[PDB]
Amino acid sequence: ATSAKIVMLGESGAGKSSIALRFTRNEFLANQETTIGAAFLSKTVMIDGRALKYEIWDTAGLERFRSLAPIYYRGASGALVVYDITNSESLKKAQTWIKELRANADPSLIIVLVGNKKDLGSLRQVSFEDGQRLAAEEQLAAFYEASAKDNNNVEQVFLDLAAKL
Ligand SMILES: Nc1nc2c(ncn2[C@@H]2O[C@H](COP(=O)(O)OP(=O)(O)O)[C@@H](O)[C@H]2O)c(=O)[nH]1
Numbered sequence: 001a002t003s004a005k006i007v008m009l010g011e012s013g014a015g016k017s018s019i020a021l022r023f024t025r026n027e028f029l030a031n032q033e034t035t036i037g038a039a040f041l042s043k044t045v046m047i048d049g050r051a052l053k054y055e056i057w058d059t060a061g062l063e064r065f066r067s068l069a070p071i072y073y074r075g076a077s078g079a080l081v082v083y084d085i086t087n088s089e090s091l092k093k094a095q096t097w098i099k100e101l102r103a104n105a106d107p108s109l110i111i112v113l114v115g116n117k118k119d120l121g122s123l124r125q126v127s128f129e130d131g132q133r134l135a136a137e138e139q140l141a142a143f144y145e146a147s148a149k150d151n152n153n154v155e156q157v158f159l160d161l162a163a164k165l
């Protein structure tokens with residue numbers, strides 16, 4: 001297996017931990033304390049060419065302080081910037097995380113935007129096009145809407161990354 005460090009980013013409550021845990025363990029946990037999610041998760045996948053070990057880094061709740069350590073970002077091949085489609089403020093802050101990620105990691109980083117909790121259709125505050133516009137303005141690698149809870153569109157986010165690595 002060749003390894004790629006992939007970092008989760010985005011506002012508290014967006015679903016970072018739940019996306020990482022859905023992809024790696026095919027589980028979903030409700031109302032978990034922000035500081036208790038595993039900081040480091042992994043899954044090895046057979047892509048075209050090769051076995052790829054995703055080394056997924058999660059925040060351990062430290063984004064509550066609105067900053068993350070240089071070290072978190074350093075050596076990432078990829079980044080998932082997660083917002084909550086039910087929370088317009090979370091999409092505004094996604095753009096802040098994209099600028100921090102660009103300040104701290106390689107210019108070659110693959111950056112993906114993910115609008116999570118699409119299962120909460122009644123509470124939606126931002127449109128698909130809101131997220132697509134941000135991905136266009138910031139020239140990101142990809143944009144998806146997903147549900148960590150229903151396991152809708154999570155696997156695809158990570159497999160599409162492989163390609164670009
Ligand atoms: N309905 C729904 N709730 C979600 C989804 N993903 C996460 N959640 C919930 O949203 C809250 C925050 O999730 P968490 O993964 O801890 O977010 P983080 O702070 O970004 O790591 C938790 O209560 C989760 O159970 C989802 O896709 N849909």
Ligand SMILES: [Mg+2]
Nearest residue numbers: 016017037061
């Ligand atoms: Mg978390």
